[PDB]
């Protein structure tokens, strides 16, 4: 199958697939991932590297856990930094967030292009440009940043920025976004540690929806 | 354009023990495959469902093209697509279903002897058998032998525009009795027949909360 | 094909899939079926063969509707009798259950070993050993009953305790646990007939999330 295989949604789109779903795509160097398509949003062909829609799983995961990938394809889930790495690595894909409140407010942020470097790089964020997005630019922040988990410390705080904020991101000092932090469901007292976008809805509420999405431009 | 090689309706999957509904492959007419949902459990099961809308998550209100290809998701509510369900009727003859759960959770339901949309060529023009049964009472031979219409390509036979007027995509005539593709409105709405609404179920003014279209061989 | 391919959710763990999610495996005689693997939950592998989550699926059902199995990939399900034995059938699994309350507090029990007896001897329950559960043991009681159905009384009481409690499960006047009653939605005024669980909410509270699930040792 991997040969003339598809390698993203966008291929899967093209090819006439038109439903929101699982499909099988293969990577750079042909191991098969069955991954998230959005078919819809933007006009579709996106492949989905995290979402978060119910609190369901925790997400509050050490540095082998967020390397290999975790969740469930019925709902939440962290696609895998080595996935990640290999979907960014070769071309050049666009970012979309997307942003769904508890109020039912639906907000986005898109970026010029995305990237992740592999493990030995500690998953550096290379980012690029702001085009749109009523949510505001909340992650050119953490450019050129390396990844960092409860049990793996890359920031630039003296203390560790993934316990601080119980996520994992790339984080610097510590963050202006946190879309792995916990599902805390709406105003939250404690600071910063919720599904939160400064830009958006702030350090003090946690969003109910977040979906991260790649494209090749 | 039938697939002798495997699969080519529910049904089948149901035959050979897929007992859960679910997402499943089924092979069309020239061997084309497509993942459809399949309901292993209502009357029973082995329907292929078309149709679904469960939470108002997923714009229902959209264009021709769109309506042609198919949209929405395997996670929650979609529309297969005009050429899929055309592709899925054309050959043979299949049952038409529709279940339907208001916010009470109360289920009503539909059943019509055969149901088939033509090709894009003939706009999907709905060509449906005699009604068999159900709570929810007939509101769609009313329908029967109408073009399909969306906002942007108006085939009914009003005036205006059906689809605009009532925020959906269905066989217009002049205009409904059904508008399952129309807006989520939850329930109770003061305007006038623009949710997802069955005449002769809950009214002109109740959208309901569940709503799924299905066929199943005679 | 069959040789080839993996004969539990363990195997496909092992094999690099880290998310949740429907995958086919192959049981002892080489009939392929499709099961839910729960990659996450305590080291991830588990065979997951009932599931309930949102009261949409009834589970009011007969003898042979529990024989096949019946439900939804999409969300809650029963995988079915034979299938649950044809899975527990030559080997040994540890059975575990999860459980969340509608405030989501979690709890799970694990047990030793668990295995359903054959179409032929009723499907009665032989379950292992409690070892370390928050939710207490509620099913050690039910260890060594036939299962029994609206339609079939394997019982031993004088009224038929899955008529009584509309439910589906190893009863004997009568029952400690109901995973498969009624999803009474939370605090109900009925007895014993919700998807109930003594050590856990006691007899008129209904849970959230149950998961019954499989895996070797
Ligand atoms: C990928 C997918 O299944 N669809 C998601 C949907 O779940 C989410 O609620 C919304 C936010 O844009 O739309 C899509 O991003
Ligand atoms: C997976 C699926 O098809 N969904 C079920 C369907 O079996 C049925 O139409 C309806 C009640 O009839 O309940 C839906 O949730
Ligand atoms: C099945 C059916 O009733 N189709 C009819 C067609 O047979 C008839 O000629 C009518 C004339 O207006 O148009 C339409
Ligand atoms: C627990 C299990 O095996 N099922 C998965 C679970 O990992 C996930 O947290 C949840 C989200 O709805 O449900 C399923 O996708
Ligand atoms: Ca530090
Ligand atoms: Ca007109
Ligand atoms: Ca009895």
Redesign the interface.
Known sequence: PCLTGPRTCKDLLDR?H?????HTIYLPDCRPL?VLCD??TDGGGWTVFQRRVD?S?DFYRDWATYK???????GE?WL?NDNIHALTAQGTSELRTDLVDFEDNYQFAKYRSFKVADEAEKYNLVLGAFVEGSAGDSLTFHNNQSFSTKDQDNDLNTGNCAVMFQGAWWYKNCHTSNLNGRYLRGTHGSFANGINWKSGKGYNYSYKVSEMKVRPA
Chains 1, 3 share one sequence.
């Open positions: 006439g038109f439903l929101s779903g699982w069955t078919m819809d609190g799983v290999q990938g975790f969740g469930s394809r019925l889930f895998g």
